[PDB]
Short mmCIF file of C-alpha atoms and ligand atoms in Angstrom, two decimals:
data_model
loop_
_atom_site.label_atom_id
_atom_site.label_comp_id
_atom_site.label_asym_id
_atom_site.label_seq_id
_atom_site.Cartn_x
_atom_site.Cartn_y
_atom_site.Cartn_z
CA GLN A 1 0.00 0.00 0.00
CA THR A 2 0.91 3.67 -0.38
CA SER A 3 0.08 5.88 2.62
CA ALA A 4 -0.80 9.57 2.65
CA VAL A 5 2.68 10.35 4.00
CA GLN A 6 4.34 8.33 1.23
CA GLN A 7 2.26 10.21 -1.37
CA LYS A 8 3.42 13.55 0.02
CA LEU A 9 7.04 12.39 0.05
CA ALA A 10 6.64 11.33 -3.60
CA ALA A 11 5.32 14.80 -4.48
CA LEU A 12 8.24 16.42 -2.67
CA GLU A 13 10.65 14.14 -4.52
CA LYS A 14 9.06 14.90 -7.89
CA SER A 15 9.42 18.66 -7.36
CA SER A 16 13.03 18.27 -6.19
CA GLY A 17 14.23 16.53 -9.35
CA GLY A 18 16.31 14.10 -7.26
CA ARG A 19 15.91 10.82 -5.41
CA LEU A 20 14.76 10.84 -1.77
CA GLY A 21 15.06 8.07 0.81
CA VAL A 22 13.37 8.20 4.22
CA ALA A 23 13.07 5.85 7.16
CA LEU A 24 11.33 6.64 10.46
CA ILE A 25 11.15 4.39 13.50
CA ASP A 26 8.67 5.53 16.16
CA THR A 27 9.91 3.85 19.34
CA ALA A 28 6.54 4.34 21.07
CA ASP A 29 4.98 1.55 18.99
CA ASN A 30 8.01 0.38 16.93
CA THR A 31 6.21 1.25 13.72
CA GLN A 32 8.11 2.35 10.65
CA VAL A 33 7.45 4.75 7.80
CA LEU A 34 9.61 4.25 4.73
CA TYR A 35 10.08 5.89 1.36
CA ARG A 36 12.55 4.11 -0.95
CA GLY A 37 13.55 2.47 2.34
CA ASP A 38 15.40 -0.44 0.71
CA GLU A 39 17.18 1.52 -2.03
CA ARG A 40 20.88 2.26 -1.65
CA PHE A 41 22.18 5.78 -1.12
CA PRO A 42 25.70 7.18 -0.59
CA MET A 43 26.14 7.78 3.14
CA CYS A 44 28.79 10.50 2.92
CA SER A 45 29.59 11.87 6.41
CA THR A 46 26.63 10.11 8.01
CA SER A 47 29.08 7.16 8.11
CA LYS A 48 31.06 9.02 10.82
CA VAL A 49 28.49 7.80 13.37
CA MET A 50 29.40 4.17 12.65
CA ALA A 51 33.13 4.89 12.91
CA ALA A 52 32.82 6.77 16.20
CA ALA A 53 30.57 4.04 17.61
CA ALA A 54 33.08 1.35 16.60
CA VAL A 55 35.79 3.16 18.57
CA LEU A 56 33.40 3.52 21.54
CA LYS A 57 32.88 -0.25 21.39
CA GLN A 58 36.66 -0.78 21.52
CA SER A 59 36.83 1.50 24.55
CA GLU A 60 34.50 -0.81 26.48
CA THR A 61 37.46 -3.12 27.10
CA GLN A 62 40.16 -0.37 27.24
CA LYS A 63 39.27 2.21 29.90
CA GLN A 64 41.99 4.64 28.71
CA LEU A 65 41.52 4.22 24.93
CA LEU A 66 39.69 7.53 24.41
CA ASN A 67 42.71 9.35 25.89
CA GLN A 68 45.07 7.67 23.41
CA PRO A 69 47.04 10.24 21.38
CA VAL A 70 47.11 10.16 17.58
CA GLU A 71 49.74 12.08 15.62
CA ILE A 72 48.45 14.69 13.17
CA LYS A 73 50.97 15.29 10.39
CA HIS A 74 50.61 17.76 7.54
CA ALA A 75 50.25 14.89 5.05
CA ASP A 76 47.19 13.64 6.97
CA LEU A 77 45.19 16.77 6.19
CA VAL A 78 42.50 16.14 3.59
CA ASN A 79 39.86 18.52 2.23
CA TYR A 80 37.95 19.70 5.33
CA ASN A 81 39.95 19.76 8.55
CA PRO A 82 38.57 22.55 10.76
CA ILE A 83 39.77 20.96 14.01
CA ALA A 84 42.65 18.72 12.94
CA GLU A 85 44.55 21.47 11.12
CA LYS A 86 45.09 23.24 14.45
CA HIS A 87 47.02 20.21 15.73
CA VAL A 88 49.41 19.53 12.84
CA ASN A 89 52.79 18.42 14.28
CA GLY A 90 50.91 17.62 17.51
CA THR A 91 48.36 15.10 18.69
CA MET A 92 44.66 14.64 19.33
CA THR A 93 43.09 11.98 21.51
CA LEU A 94 40.55 9.50 20.15
CA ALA A 95 37.86 11.32 22.14
CA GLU A 96 38.89 14.63 20.54
CA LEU A 97 38.90 13.02 17.10
CA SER A 98 35.45 11.51 17.68
CA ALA A 99 34.04 14.85 18.81
CA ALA A 100 35.61 16.65 15.83
CA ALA A 101 34.31 14.06 13.34
CA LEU A 102 30.78 14.09 14.73
CA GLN A 103 30.26 17.72 15.75
CA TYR A 104 32.29 19.55 13.09
CA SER A 105 32.33 16.84 10.38
CA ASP A 106 36.16 16.94 10.27
CA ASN A 107 37.40 14.58 7.54
CA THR A 108 40.93 14.17 8.92
CA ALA A 109 39.41 13.15 12.25
CA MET A 110 37.26 10.56 10.47
CA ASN A 111 40.36 9.10 8.77
CA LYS A 112 42.01 8.67 12.18
CA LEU A 113 38.93 6.78 13.43
CA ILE A 114 38.98 4.55 10.33
CA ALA A 115 42.70 3.86 10.85
CA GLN A 116 42.12 2.97 14.52
CA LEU A 117 39.68 0.31 13.24
CA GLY A 118 42.14 -1.06 10.67
CA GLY A 119 40.65 0.60 7.60
CA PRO A 120 37.18 0.94 6.04
CA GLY A 121 36.51 -2.79 6.38
CA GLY A 122 36.94 -2.47 10.14
CA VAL A 123 33.98 -0.09 10.19
CA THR A 124 31.94 -2.53 8.10
CA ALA A 125 32.89 -5.38 10.44
CA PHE A 126 31.55 -3.41 13.40
CA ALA A 127 28.29 -2.78 11.53
CA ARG A 128 27.95 -6.53 10.97
CA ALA A 129 28.68 -7.20 14.65
CA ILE A 130 25.72 -5.02 15.68
CA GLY A 131 23.32 -6.62 13.19
CA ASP A 132 23.63 -4.27 10.20
CA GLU A 133 24.04 -6.45 7.09
CA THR A 134 23.59 -3.53 4.66
CA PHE A 135 26.11 -0.83 5.57
CA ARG A 136 29.40 -0.87 3.70
CA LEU A 137 32.39 1.45 4.01
CA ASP A 138 34.89 0.92 1.22
CA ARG A 139 37.05 4.07 1.11
CA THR A 140 38.59 6.72 3.33
CA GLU A 141 37.99 10.47 3.26
CA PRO A 142 37.59 12.30 1.01
CA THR A 143 36.83 9.79 -1.76
CA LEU A 144 34.04 8.05 0.13
CA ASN A 145 31.92 11.14 -0.79
CA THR A 146 32.04 10.77 -4.60
CA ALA A 147 28.41 9.58 -4.44
CA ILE A 148 28.26 8.33 -8.05
CA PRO A 149 24.79 7.01 -9.01
CA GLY A 150 24.69 3.21 -9.06
CA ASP A 151 28.05 2.85 -7.27
CA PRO A 152 27.64 0.42 -4.34
CA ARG A 153 30.70 1.69 -2.45
CA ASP A 154 30.09 3.60 0.78
CA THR A 155 26.32 3.09 0.74
CA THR A 156 23.48 1.88 2.91
CA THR A 157 19.68 1.89 2.84
CA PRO A 158 17.44 4.21 4.88
CA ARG A 159 15.85 1.23 6.66
CA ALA A 160 19.19 -0.24 7.71
CA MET A 161 20.63 3.07 8.90
CA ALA A 162 17.55 3.91 10.98
CA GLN A 163 17.66 0.49 12.65
CA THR A 164 21.37 0.87 13.38
CA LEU A 165 21.04 4.40 14.72
CA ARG A 166 18.26 3.21 17.04
CA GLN A 167 20.38 0.34 18.38
CA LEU A 168 23.40 2.63 18.94
CA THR A 169 21.60 5.55 20.60
CA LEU A 170 18.52 4.05 22.27
CA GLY A 171 19.30 0.31 22.39
CA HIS A 172 22.15 -1.80 23.67
CA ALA A 173 24.62 -2.03 20.80
CA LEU A 174 26.96 -0.04 23.08
CA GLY A 175 27.50 -0.13 26.82
CA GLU A 176 25.49 2.37 28.85
CA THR A 177 28.24 4.98 29.31
CA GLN A 178 29.31 4.65 25.66
CA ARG A 179 25.72 5.10 24.46
CA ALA A 180 25.42 8.21 26.63
CA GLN A 181 28.65 9.60 25.16
CA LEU A 182 27.43 9.02 21.60
CA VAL A 183 24.13 10.76 22.39
CA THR A 184 25.96 13.71 23.98
CA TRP A 185 28.14 14.07 20.88
CA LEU A 186 25.17 13.95 18.49
CA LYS A 187 23.19 16.47 20.56
CA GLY A 188 26.11 18.91 20.30
CA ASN A 189 26.40 18.73 16.52
CA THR A 190 27.06 22.17 14.99
CA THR A 191 26.03 21.41 11.39
CA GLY A 192 22.38 20.39 11.56
CA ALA A 193 20.04 23.36 11.91
CA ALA A 194 19.10 23.55 8.21
CA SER A 195 18.44 19.80 7.76
CA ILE A 196 15.99 17.49 9.63
CA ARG A 197 15.84 19.95 12.56
CA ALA A 198 14.43 22.70 10.35
CA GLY A 199 11.36 20.60 9.57
CA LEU A 200 10.47 19.76 13.18
CA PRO A 201 8.76 21.71 15.97
CA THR A 202 11.32 23.84 17.77
CA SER A 203 10.36 22.39 21.16
CA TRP A 204 11.74 18.96 20.24
CA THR A 205 15.33 17.95 20.95
CA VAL A 206 17.46 16.50 18.16
CA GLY A 207 20.86 14.83 17.90
CA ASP A 208 21.96 14.40 14.31
CA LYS A 209 24.79 13.83 11.84
CA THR A 210 24.77 15.46 8.39
CA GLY A 211 26.52 14.48 5.19
CA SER A 212 27.02 15.81 1.68
CA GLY A 213 29.04 14.99 -1.40
CA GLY A 214 29.03 14.64 -5.14
CA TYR A 215 25.87 14.58 -7.22
CA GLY A 216 24.25 17.10 -4.89
CA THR A 217 24.05 14.43 -2.21
CA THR A 218 22.53 15.85 0.97
CA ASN A 219 21.89 13.64 3.99
CA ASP A 220 20.96 13.72 7.67
CA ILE A 221 20.37 11.04 10.31
CA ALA A 222 18.76 11.96 13.61
CA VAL A 223 17.52 10.76 16.96
CA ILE A 224 14.59 12.90 18.05
CA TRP A 225 13.02 13.45 21.47
CA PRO A 226 9.59 14.98 20.80
CA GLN A 227 7.81 16.83 23.59
CA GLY A 228 6.00 14.27 25.71
CA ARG A 229 6.34 11.03 23.74
CA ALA A 230 8.80 8.27 22.98
CA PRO A 231 11.89 9.05 20.86
CA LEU A 232 11.98 8.74 17.10
CA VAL A 233 14.78 7.84 14.72
CA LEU A 234 14.69 9.51 11.31
CA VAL A 235 16.99 9.07 8.27
CA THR A 236 16.71 11.36 5.23
CA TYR A 237 18.96 10.74 2.22
CA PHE A 238 18.86 12.72 -1.01
CA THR A 239 20.90 12.56 -4.23
CA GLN A 240 20.66 14.14 -7.68
CA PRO A 241 21.44 13.17 -11.29
CA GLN A 242 24.26 15.61 -12.15
CA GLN A 243 27.71 15.56 -10.54
CA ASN A 244 27.82 19.30 -9.83
CA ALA A 245 24.29 19.65 -8.44
CA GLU A 246 23.69 22.08 -5.58
CA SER A 247 22.84 20.60 -2.22
CA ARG A 248 19.25 20.70 -0.95
CA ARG A 249 19.13 20.68 2.86
CA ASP A 250 15.65 22.19 2.53
CA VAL A 251 14.43 18.93 0.96
CA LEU A 252 15.50 17.06 4.10
CA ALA A 253 13.67 19.61 6.24
CA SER A 254 10.58 19.22 4.02
CA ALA A 255 10.71 15.42 4.38
CA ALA A 256 11.00 15.75 8.16
CA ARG A 257 8.03 18.15 8.20
CA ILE A 258 5.86 15.68 6.26
CA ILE A 259 6.89 12.89 8.64
CA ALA A 260 6.09 14.99 11.72
CA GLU A 261 2.68 15.95 10.32
CA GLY A 262 1.84 12.28 9.87
CA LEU A 263 2.52 11.17 13.45
O1 R6Z B 1 34.48 15.73 1.37
C1 R6Z B 1 33.57 16.18 0.77
N1 R6Z B 1 32.49 16.87 1.41
C2 R6Z B 1 32.41 17.08 2.83
C3 R6Z B 1 33.53 17.22 3.64
C4 R6Z B 1 33.37 17.41 5.00
C5 R6Z B 1 32.11 17.44 5.56
C6 R6Z B 1 31.01 17.29 4.73
C7 R6Z B 1 29.63 17.35 5.32
N2 R6Z B 1 29.34 17.12 6.60
N3 R6Z B 1 28.02 17.28 6.72
N4 R6Z B 1 27.50 17.61 5.55
N5 R6Z B 1 28.51 17.67 4.64
C8 R6Z B 1 31.14 17.11 3.38
C9 R6Z B 1 33.48 16.03 -0.74
C10 R6Z B 1 32.57 16.75 -1.50
C11 R6Z B 1 32.54 16.55 -2.88
C12 R6Z B 1 31.59 17.30 -3.78
N6 R6Z B 1 30.67 18.20 -3.41
N7 R6Z B 1 30.07 18.62 -4.56
N8 R6Z B 1 30.60 17.98 -5.60
N9 R6Z B 1 31.55 17.16 -5.11
C13 R6Z B 1 33.39 15.65 -3.49
C14 R6Z B 1 34.28 14.94 -2.72
C15 R6Z B 1 35.21 13.93 -3.35
F1 R6Z B 1 36.42 13.95 -2.75
F2 R6Z B 1 34.65 12.70 -3.17
F3 R6Z B 1 35.32 14.16 -4.68
C16 R6Z B 1 34.33 15.13 -1.35
O1 R6Z B 2 33.01 21.43 3.40
C1 R6Z B 2 32.07 20.91 2.90
N1 R6Z B 2 32.11 20.26 1.62
C2 R6Z B 2 33.31 20.17 0.81
C3 R6Z B 2 34.57 20.12 1.38
C4 R6Z B 2 35.69 20.04 0.56
C5 R6Z B 2 35.52 19.99 -0.81
C6 R6Z B 2 34.26 20.03 -1.36
C7 R6Z B 2 34.07 19.96 -2.87
N2 R6Z B 2 34.74 19.13 -3.70
N3 R6Z B 2 34.28 19.37 -4.96
N4 R6Z B 2 33.35 20.32 -4.88
N5 R6Z B 2 33.21 20.69 -3.59
C8 R6Z B 2 33.14 20.12 -0.56
C9 R6Z B 2 30.74 20.93 3.62
C10 R6Z B 2 29.54 20.95 2.92
C11 R6Z B 2 28.35 20.98 3.63
C12 R6Z B 2 27.04 21.02 2.88
N6 R6Z B 2 26.90 21.49 1.65
N7 R6Z B 2 25.59 21.37 1.33
N8 R6Z B 2 24.93 20.86 2.37
N9 R6Z B 2 25.84 20.65 3.35
C13 R6Z B 2 28.35 20.98 5.01
C14 R6Z B 2 29.56 20.94 5.69
C15 R6Z B 2 29.57 20.93 7.20
F1 R6Z B 2 30.70 20.37 7.67
F2 R6Z B 2 29.50 22.20 7.67
F3 R6Z B 2 28.52 20.23 7.69
C16 R6Z B 2 30.76 20.93 5.00
#
C-alpha cells in the first residue's frame, strides 16, 4: 500500500528533481514509515556515526583508549579539517577526534577513526557485529563522498541506517556509558540546523549527523526526542542526477516536516 505520507514524500521528490530516501522508527509503537527504504544511497559523512561508535565499542574493554594520542601530520590533512589542522605536528586523543568528526564533520578526524579500526573494512565489520548487514564502508575520506549514481561503495539503505542508529543511541549495541557519550556528541552537533531539525517543531530535541558529497548528495540522520512522547529515529537521504548539483538541505527539512505531520 501507499500511505498519505508516502504520497506527500513522492510529491516532494518529484518537485526536487532528485531521489529521496526516508526511514522513520517511532519507538513508542516500533512502527516504521519508509520511502525508498530499501534503495541504496551514498552515506557520505553520516558514516562518521558508525566509525565513532566502533571506537566507543573498543573503549568498552580499554578504559583509557579515548585518551590515546594520535599524531596529526601535515600529510594527513585532507579537504575539510577545521579541528585537525590546528594540531598539525601535535596530537589529538581518540575522544577529541570523535568529537571533531561528529560535531564539526572533520574529515581528517574521520580518517584517524577509520585507521584505529584497521581501515574501512573495520567499520563494516563493526556494523555486521551489531546486526547491520547492509552498511558498507569501502574508502577513506575524502573519496568516500564521490556519491556516483549506481556505485555500491560507501552506501546503505534508509531502513538499515535507521535500525542501526536506534540500536546505537537508544538500544544496547553499546555499553550504557558509551551510548550516553554518543548521544551527547550527536546532541552537540554544529552542522544540523538547516536539515531534519528545520522541519520539526522547535520544542523537540534533536541529535543528528549530516553528510554531503558529489551529485548534490545531501543527507541527515537523527535521533529525536519529541515533547511528551517516545523518541523517534529519522533518516533522510537525497541525491541528484548531475555531478555538480547544488545541495538541498531544505528537501531534508521538508521530508521531516511531512513525517512529523503524519505522526
Ligand atoms: O568531502 C567532501 N564533502 C564534505 C567534507 C566534509 C564534511 C562534509 C559534510 N558534513 N556534513 N554535511 N557535509 C562534506 C566532498 C565533496 C565533494 C563534492 N561536493 N560537490 N561535488 N563534489 C566531493 C568529494 C570527493 F572527494 F569525493 F570528490 C568530497
Ligand atoms: O566542506 C564541505 N564540503 C566540501 C569540502 C571540501 C571539498 C568540497 C568539494 N569538492 N568538490 N566540490 N566541492 C566540498 C561541507 C559541505 C556541507 C554542505 N553542503 N551542502 N549541504 N551541506 C556541510 C559541511 C559541514 F561540515 F559544515 F557540515 C561541510
